[PDB]
Structure 1
C-alpha cells in the first residue's frame, strides 16, 4: 500500500513499454490490465524490475502514493471512458489521471471538465515515437491543469527523449484541457503527410526511373545525411533492406497496398475544416490512404481506364535531385499549413499554444523527428507571433530555390501518369499563398448571383449586393 510512485493501466505494448520507461528512471510502477493474464505476462518477463503486480483496480489504486499518478494507455473512445468510470470511485480529490492514448481532443475537453467536477486532475497527453519510443524516450504533449502538470513534469522530463541539439527534454506544458491531445493530433496529421510525400518519392523513383529497392535505399541514405535528415526517411531505407520472411525478395513488395488509419490524421483534417484553415497536403494524405483502401475497385479500374506510356528521356541523377528538392519543399508546405492550424486552434480554444516549444519538443522522440525542426523553432524564436513559416527568411530562401525543381517533378509525374496528390497540392498551396489576388472574386460573384450572399469590395469598406437580374 502506497509503495508505487506511478501507475500504468493498459498492458498492451505501448502501456507496457511506458511502464518500463518510468521504472527504468528509478521509480516503482504499479501495473494493471483489464484481462489479468496480460499483467502476469509482463510481470514475469520483468521480475527484476521494480514493478508492482496488481490484479484488481482497488489493489492498483491502493498501491499508489498520494496524490496518485495514474497513466491510462488503453484503446481510445469508449474503452478510455470505461476505465475512467472504473477508476473514479477509488480515487481521492487531488489525484491525477493521465490519458496517454491517441484520444480525439474534444473527448479530453469533456473528460477534463467532468473530472474537475469530482476534484480529479486530468492530463491528456500525446505520446509520440512508436513502441520503441515509448520504451526509450517519447515526445510528450501534456495538457490540463498546470498545477497538476507541475507534479508530473519531473517524471515526464526523465522518460522523454532529449533533443540532440541542446539536450532539452521533449516534453512541455501545451496548455489547458485538450491542448496536448490537439498538438499530438497535429503531429500525427503531419506524420501522414510526410509518409505520403515519402511514398510518392518512392513511387517516382520506382516507376519513372525504374530503380530497385537497393538503389532507392541508397538514395534515401544519402538524402538522410543532408537537410532531409529525419527518422521517417531513416526507417524507410531500413524497411527497404528487409527480406521477405515468408518467400523470395523483399517484405515491402509483399505488403498489400491498403493503408490503415486509427483516426488522428482524419481528425486533423476535420479540425482544419472546422476552423477555416487551409490544410490540403495532410488532407490529400488521408484521402490517399482512403483510395488505397479501395483496392478491389482499383483492380477493376486498371483494366478499363487508360493512361500514358512511360519512356523516361532525362538524366537519372539530376531528376533524383529534383525529387529530393521537391520532397523538402513539400514538407515545408505541410508544416507551414500545420502550424497555421495550431495558430487558429490556439485562438479558437484559448490555449495560448507555445509554437516554438512545440517545434522544440518534436526535435527528438516523436515520429516526425528531423533536423529541420530546429529551423522551425528558430523561426518562432525570431517571432513568436509569426503567422506562417513561409514568411521566415530560412524558408523564403528554400522555396525560392526549390520551386523550379518542384514544377519539373510535377510536370514529369503528371505526363508519366504517376499519382502525386501531395506533391501537386504542395505547389498549388505555394502558388495560392503567394497570390495577392485569387479567382475567388468570381466565386463571390456567382454566390451573390444565385444566393444574394453579398460581397466586399476591393475599393471601399462595407457589404454589398448587386442587382444581377433587374
Structure 2
C-alpha cells in the first residue's frame, strides 16, 4: 500500500506533472491543502493510478522510502509553509523537489536548512508550460547530486525527448544551481522577445509593411540562421485574424507583464558585476510599456520625428535581419558570461556547454544556434566571451554594419530601439581598448580621493586636481 512519488499542489502545473509521472508506469500520490482541488483530480483520473490523500500525514505515509515529494505549490511563502509542515513528518534521506519558478536564493536557503535535518532539497526549473508539463517538460534540477540520481529515472521518463532521443534533463549542480539556470535562460528569452518586438516596430512603423509581409518575413527568417521557436511562433501570431479579418496582434493592449525572473536575473547580474545590458533594457522596456495611460498622455505632449523611409525597403529588411541575429548573439554572450561568473561565486562548477537548452529558442528541435553555443564552450571551456568564439566572432564583425545602420535610422526616425542600441553599444564597449573611464577615475579621485592607476607607470596615485 505504497506509492513511488507524491505531488503536492494540484493546480494545472502540478496536476499535469502527476499525470505525466503516472503515464510512465509510476504510482503517484497527490495532495492539495484545499480539498476541492484534489478530489476534482480524482474524477479526472478515473483510469489512472492516482492515489488521493487528504492529510499531510497520510500523504507522507503513503510514499515508499526514501520518499520523493514533488512540490508544485505557490512560489514564495506558500512553498516555505508546505516544507515547514512536511519536515516533522519526514525521515532521514527523503527528497523534496520544488518544481516551481523559485528565486534561486530561496532554493539555496531551503536546501541549506533542510540539509541540517538530513532532508534533501532539489530545486528544479520546469519549462514548457501546462502543455509541456503534461507531455514532457525540460527540467533543470539542482541540489544534492545523490538525491538527483535517486530520482533521475523518473525525471528522465517524464522529460521531453530531443531529436537525438536524449532526455531534456540533466543535473545542473548543487543547491540553487538549477533554478538559477532556469532564471538566466528566461532572461535570455526576455532579450530575444524585445529584439523581435523592435524588429516588428521598424517593419511596421518605418517600412510600412502589412501584417502579411511581417509574418512572411519572420517565417523566412526562421528558415535560416534565426531558426528558433520564438521566431516561428511570431510568424503564426501575425497571421491569426480577429472578428473583422484584422490582425488580432494589433488590438492587444501593449502593456507587457512579468512574474519576476526578469527582475531577478538583472539584479543578479548587477550583484555579480556582469554587464547584462540587453536583458536589462528588455526588463526595463516591459516596465515602460505598463505605464500605458502615462504613455498616451506623454504622446500628446512630447513630439518627435515622423518616420520616413525613401530607400530600398527590402534591403533594409535584410539589415534588420542581421541586426536581430547579432543582437541575439550579444544577448547570449552576456547571459553566458553571467552564468560563468555565477558558477564561480557560488562554487557550482557549471558546464556552460551543457546549459544551452533554452526552451523558447528551439530546445527539442535541436536548433543550430543552441548547438553552436554548446560547441563554443565545449571546444574552449575557458572561453571568456561568446563574441570571441570563431563562429560568432565572424558574424558580429560582418553584421555590425547592418546593426549600426538599423540603430541609426531608428533613432533618427523616433522608433525606440533599447535592445538594438544596447547591442551595438556593448560590442563597441567590449572591443574598445580604451574607454573614457579614465575621466571617471579622475573625477572619483578628486571627489572621494579614490586613487587611480596609470597606463605607463605601476602603482596607485592620488592627485590634487585643482
Provide the TM-score with structure 1 as the length reference: 0.95
What SS is found at the alignment partner of 2:461?
A: coil
| Long gaps (5+) in structure 1 | none
- Does the CA-based 8 Å contact 2:185-2:358 persist in structure 1? no
Aligned equivalent of 2:94: 95
**Aligned equivalent of 1:344, options 341, 350, 356:** 341
- Does the CA-based 8 Å contact 2:6-2:70 persist in structure 1? yes
What SS is found at the alignment partner of 2:460?
A: coil
Aligned equivalent of 1:455: 452
Q: Deviation of residue 248 (structure 1)?
A: 5.8
Divergent runs of 4+, >6 A: none
Q: Does 1:439 align with 2:404?
A: no
Count, aligned residues: 466
Work out the CA distance in 2 between the residues paired with 1:183 and 1:264: 11
Aligned equivalent of 1:243: 241
Kindly report which structure 2 residues correspond to 1:131-150, keeping only aligned pairs within 5 A, or say none. Answer: 131-150=130-149
- Does the CA-based 8 Å contact 2:229-2:360 persist in structure 1? no
**Aligned equivalent of 2:320, options 304, 317, 323:** 323
Aligned equivalent of 1:206: 204
Aligned equivalent of 2:304: 307
Aligned equivalent of 1:55: 54
Aligned equivalent of 1:179: 177
| CA deviation vs aligned residue, 1:378-404 (integer Å, no higher than 9, x gap) | 101101111111111010111122111
What SS is found at the alignment partner of 2:303?
A: coil
Work out the CA distance in 1 between the residues paired with 2:139 and 2:32: 22
| CA deviation vs aligned residue, 1:254-294 (integer Å, no higher than 9, x gap) | 22111111110111000111111100000000000000111
Work out the CA distance in 2 between the residues paired with 1:40 and 1:150: 32
What SS is found at the alignment partner of 1:406?
A: helix
**Aligned equivalent of 1:275, options 272, 276, 285:** 272
Q: 1:301 to 1:266 in 2, by over 3 A?
A: same
- Does the CA-based 8 Å contact 1:390-1:396 persist in structure 2? yes
Q: Deviation of residue 410 (structure 1)?
A: 0.6
Q: Deviation of residue 120 (structure 1)?
A: 0.7
Aligned equivalent of 1:332: 329
What SS is found at the alignment partner of 2:96?
A: strand
Structure 1 range deviating more: 233-242 or 419-428 = 233-242
| CA deviation vs aligned residue, 1:90-120 (integer Å, no higher than 9, x gap) | 2111000001111111111110011111111
**Aligned equivalent of 1:378, options 375, 380, 403:** 375
- Does the CA-based 8 Å contact 1:191-1:367 persist in structure 2? no
Work out the CA distance in 1 between the residues paired with 2:110 and 2:96: 10
Q: Deviation of residue 369 (structure 1)?
A: 7.4
Q: Does 1:38 align with 2:37?
A: yes
Q: 1:39 to 1:249 in 2, by over 3 A?
A: farther
Work out the CA distance in 1 between the residues paired with 2:448 and 2:412: 39
Q: Does 1:153 align with 2:152?
A: yes
Aligned equivalent of 2:281: 284
What SS is found at the alignment partner of 2:432?
A: coil
Q: Does 1:407 align with 2:417?
A: no
Provide the TM-score with structure 2 as the length reference: 0.96
Work out the CA distance in 2 between the residues paired with 1:37 and 1:238: 38
Work out the CA distance in 2 between the residues paired with 1:203 and 1:69: 48
Aligned equivalent of 1:28: 27
- By relative contact order (CA 8 Å, sep 6+), the higher-ranking structure is 1
**Aligned equivalent of 1:229, options 227, 230, 234:** 227
Work out the CA distance in 2 between the residues paired with 1:21 and 1:206: 42
Aligned equivalent of 2:387: 390
| Long gaps (5+) in structure 2 | none
Work out the CA distance in 1 between the residues paired with 2:252 and 2:262: 22
- Does the CA-based 8 Å contact 1:232-1:367 persist in structure 2? no
Structure 1 range deviating more: 19-28 or 77-86 = 19-28
